[PDB]
Design a protein around this ligand. Structure first.
Ligand SMILES: [Ba+2]
Ligand SMILES: [Ca+2]
Ligand SMILES: [Ca+2]
Ligand SMILES: [Ca+2]
Ligand SMILES: [Ca+2]
Ligand SMILES: [Cl-]
Lengths: 423, 192
């Protein structure tokens, strides 16, 4: 597939390194200046642009990343709905998304820089030394009963998720169940190191009902580039239209001595959530995350969460649709999620490539890995590793080139980057 | 997931889906009319209107016709009767702004109506389009309850035939291969 980054003119130069990396790692990424769509930027204009981009040759548009807060790129507003997800609802009068939507909500250049830096570091720079991975945090309220999804209390619901994660390979589960959860309990879980967090309970625009951990406690986080992604079942935690930064925005924008803290990604609601339907969505998200043979789309934060929310519409109908529309992705929707401590890949590639070459062979011990040839952020060719090798087909001449960049990414693998000399 | 729910047949857009009751349980709850029962079963979901009996349903997605309106027909059904049963009334859609433990079970006017609720043992949800595939959800309602007679009908097996009609459908459509695995996981009749 491919991604379009919709960016305000003031942030156009700042997203350059991000776009380079996405193309370098095998995801075709283009930029659209928000003011070039319409000035001022309206929800309706974004819709007709995403729809017209989707209809372009190949029908391969899969991700849309929105850059900026609501004043920069607005959310679609309808009675009782604040939505970014509706931008991905292109084919059919239904709530089943064709395109995965994500947002880098920022009110400063620093807010954008830290969201770019944390995304690139997560995909490119995570090593076998990142031992905070494969550790999850389960948070639950002391409420829920027969009226909830699968007649489970929030604690019973989180305990089932905890068992599923442990079975998959998560080496540590931190359980913070009400009564008595304090903000310090959450601060310590983040600082100790976690790669996933699940929340089920009440919420406000700036805090969690269970723990009372909020936007004011985010400055106490010291998890420098040790960031979890969160499946958040709570009201208004993702209301990025609020007069002060919302819960999800504070965690995505968090910095400590120029290093990213908080979260790499979070799915949080812009409105009050229903009791049962988001529990179903949260379960399916964790089940898709814990799948053994999913596609490269179900390997992304947008793909995992959206496919999880599809079951919610299937089982809870109109109420599930209302939850899907408002359960907003904060972060890169194409983010290649990590669940465990990565293992190294054995990558064998020729040191040189012929100027008149049409293909490039790459040997890799991990089948399903994506091998990509790039030229300073411009994708030259990409191929999947099958039967121990990737045969990269060049989509342009490299006759005048001196060097090419080879990038190999793999699920829960250390990213391999090599230089290829052009002979 | 209910393991007894299986695809019997699949030809073009036509599908034969079998439902079988799995792990049916009843939870006793406090109500104004005394102890009432909250029914639960594997993959069972309560979408019952507030004040009407809690009668969980099972929903499954199917890849359907691209241009025509679909219909659902019960080709096979089997039920057992449970007499003098008090089924708990639905609390409806509860917001996470509320505490459900503090919300009481309140009986609506539907509890004075001498008929079986919801009425249909099989329905179709509104058709949708997921990228290049037109889909539709089939719903099994294996718990039918008459509040006046206090009789509960437990459908142990329901076989439905989902086929196209002579009518034009709602939300109709009209290389990339990335959504193939999504179609396989969403639709139980896609691989077939
Ligand atoms: Ba659950
Ligand atoms: Ca759609
Ligand atoms: Ca905001
Ligand atoms: Ca060049
Ligand atoms: Ca370079
Ligand atoms: Cl129809």
């Amino acid at each position: 597939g491919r991604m379009i980054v919709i960016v305000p003119k003031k942030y156009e130069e700042d997203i350059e390194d991000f776009v380079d990396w996405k193309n370098q790692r095998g995801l075709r990424t283009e930029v659209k200046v928000a003011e070039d769509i319409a000035s001022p930027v309206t929800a309706n204009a974004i819709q007709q642009f995403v729809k017209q981009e989707y209809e372009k040759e190949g029908n391969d548009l899969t991700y849309v990343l929105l850059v900026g807060d609501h004043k920069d790129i607005p959310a679609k507003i309808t009675p009782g709905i604040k939505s970014d997800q509706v931008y991905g609802q292109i084919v059919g009068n239904d709530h089943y998304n064709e395109v995965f939507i994500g947002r880098f909500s920022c009110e400063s250049k620093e807010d954008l820089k830290t969201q770019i830096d944390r995304t690139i570091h997560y995909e490119r720079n995570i090593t076998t030394e990142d031992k905070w991975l494969g550790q999850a945090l389960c948070i639950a309220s002391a409420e829920g009963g027969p009226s909830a999804d699968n007649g489970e209390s929030d604690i019973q619901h989180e305990n089932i998720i905890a068992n599923l994660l442990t079975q998959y390979g998560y080496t540590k589960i931190i359980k913070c169940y009400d009564p008595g959860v304090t903000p310090k309990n959450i601060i310590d879980a983040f600082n100790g190191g976690i790669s996933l967090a699940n929340y089920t309970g009440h919420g406000s625009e700036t805090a969690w009902g269970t723990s009372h951990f909020g936007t004011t406690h985010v400055k106490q986080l010291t998890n420098s580039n040790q960031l979890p992604f969160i499946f958040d079942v709570a009201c208004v935690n993702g209301d990025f239209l609020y007069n002060v930064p919302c819960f999800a925005e504070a965690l995505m924008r968090a910095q400590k001595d120029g290093k990213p803290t908080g979260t790499v990604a979070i799915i949080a609601s812009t409105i009050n959530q229903s009791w049962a339907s988001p529990m179903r969505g949260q379960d399916e998200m964790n089940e898709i995350l814990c799948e053994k043979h999913p596609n490269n789309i179900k390997r992304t934060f947008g793909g995992v969460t959206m496919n999880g929310m599809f079951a919610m519409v299937e089982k809870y109908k109109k109420d599930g649709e209302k939850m899907l529309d408002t359960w907003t992705v904060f972060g890169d929707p194409s983010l290649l999620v990590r669940t465990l401590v990565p293992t190294k890949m054995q990558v064998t590639a020729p040191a040189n490539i012929s100027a008149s070459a049409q293909t490039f062979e790459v040997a890799c011990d991990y089948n399903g890995a994506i091998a990509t040839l790039s030229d300073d952020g411009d994708m030259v060719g990409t191929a999947i590793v099958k039967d121990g090798k990737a045969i990269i087909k060049l989509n342009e001449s490299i006759a005048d080139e001196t060097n090419l960049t080879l990038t190999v990414v793999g699920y829960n693998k250390v990213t391999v980057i090599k230089d290829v000399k052009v002979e | 997931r209910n393991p007894q729910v299986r695809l019997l047949s699949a030809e073009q857009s036509m599908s034969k889906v079998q439902f079988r009751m799995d792990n049916l349980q009843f939870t006793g709850v406090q109500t104004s009319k005394g102890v009432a029962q909250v029914p639960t079963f594997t993959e069972g979901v309560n979408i019952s209107e507030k004040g009407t009996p809690i009668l969980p349903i099972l929903s499954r997605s199917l890849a359907v016709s691209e241009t025509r309106a679909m219909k659902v027909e019960v080709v096979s059904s089997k039920f057992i009767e449970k007499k003098d049963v008090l089924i708990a009334p639905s609390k409806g859609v509860i917001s996470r702004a509320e505490n459900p433990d503090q919300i009481p079970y309140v009986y609506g006017q539907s509890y004075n109506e001498d008929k079986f609720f919801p009425g249909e043992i099989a329905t179709l949800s509104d058709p949708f389009i997921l990228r290049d595939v037109r889909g539709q959800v089939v719903n099994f309602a294996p718990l039918q309850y008459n509040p006046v007679t206090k009789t509960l009908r437990i459908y142990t097996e329901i076989v439905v035939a989902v086929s196209e009609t002579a009518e034009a459908g709602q939300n109709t459509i009209s290389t990339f291969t990335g959504f193939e695995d999504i179609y396989k996981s969403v639709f139980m009749n896609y691989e077939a």
